[PDB]
Amino acid sequence: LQKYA
Amino acid sequence: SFKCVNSLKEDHNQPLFGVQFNWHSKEGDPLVFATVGSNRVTLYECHSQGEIRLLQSYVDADADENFYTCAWTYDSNTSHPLLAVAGSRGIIRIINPITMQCIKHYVGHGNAINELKFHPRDPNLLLSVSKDHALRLWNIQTDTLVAIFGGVEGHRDEVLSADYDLLGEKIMSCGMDHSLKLWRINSKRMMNAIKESYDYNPNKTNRPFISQKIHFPDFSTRDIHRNYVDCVRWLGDLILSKSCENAIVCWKPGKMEDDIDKIKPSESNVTILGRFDYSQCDIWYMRFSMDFWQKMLALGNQVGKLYVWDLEVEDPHKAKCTTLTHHKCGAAIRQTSFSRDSSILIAVCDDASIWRWDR
């Protein structure tokens, strides 16, 4: 799970 | 229908995490919007032929600040618009948008502030939601902390978003614990606390102002999404919320016929009224927005595509989707904003770009 692509 | 008329990029090349049109702009003045990213907030004016005219920024003295969110209000005595901004430092700044002076600031949250929202009927009541798992309600007329919404029955991880209902009688919050929680602020306790916050003048008394500690939501559910819930909005008595699962869910507490104001804190049921699916929005902190009248909803995804749903239909699941793409818009869209007359839609991106769509 990431905040950035 | 919407057409892309212009784009630009800010010089810091960092993500723009927020964008908001000023819906309190005066009659006959041009439409103005704010962007937040890096350690700055910037205002722009929309003009003819797609022009996006750069005005002036506020740049934080701390190069390590990162602003995440902004929200417009106005000064209740003078009518002049004000802009609240916050982010990783957990400091709320109230900015005079004319001069971009910081008028005052508020500290309290234990960590980063992920969203700011102003009360729909009271321009002085500011809600902040924080990485420290709490929400805080501020009165920016008397500079008081009215209430903290937290406790072990509050959120157990970062709060990512919240929204007031139409009349500002209740708040729905959401965050990393996968939950959505209802907090009523028209209780006798909270109405009294807001009234007392208006009567507080530290130059005329010896007491500090006592904040309410609200440790129990009036409803809670983890049955809508299965991951971080990063944006929530009331649609009348219904809720629109999203996670990073490529869906906005339309739902309500209780069973189909249950009145929202009869929902008890032990309510175990929810009702799903529809779901708007889309693609390629697997990262978190991606916010949808609605127009002033709540006739439409816009969301960008992580490869620069815009989805716009027409909600002017008899039931939520009948919403009509339109998509907007541009071959040069390929970075993640963090937030959108409609102008108050709904004639312009702005999207802001992880590569510091700003995209203007005119109807």
Numbering used by the authors:
A (entry chain B): 1217 to 1221
B (entry chain A): 81 to 439
Direct quotes from the study:
Here we provide functional and structural evidence that the vertebrate-specific PRC2 accessory subunit PALI1 emerged through a convergent evolution to mimic JARID2 at the molecular level. Mechanistically, PRC2 methylates PALI1 K1241, which then binds to the PRC2-regulatory subunit EED to allosterically activate PRC2. High-resolution crystal structures revealed that PALI1 mimics the regulatory interactions formed between JARID2 and EED.
A similar observation was previously made for EZH2 automethylation, that occurs in the recombinant protein while co-expressed with other PRC2 subunits. These results confirm that three lysines within the PRC2-interacting region of PALI1 serve as a substrate for PRC2, including K1214, K1219 and K1241. We also assayed a PALI1-K1219me3 peptide, which has a smaller positive effect on the HMTase activity of PRC2. The structures indicate that the two tri-methyl-lysine PALI1 peptides (left two panels) bind to EED in a conformation resembling that seen for the JARID2-K116me3 peptide (the third panel). Specifically, in all three cases the tri-methyl-lysine and its adjacent aromatic residue, in the +1 position, adopting the same conformation when binding to EED (marked in dashed shapes).
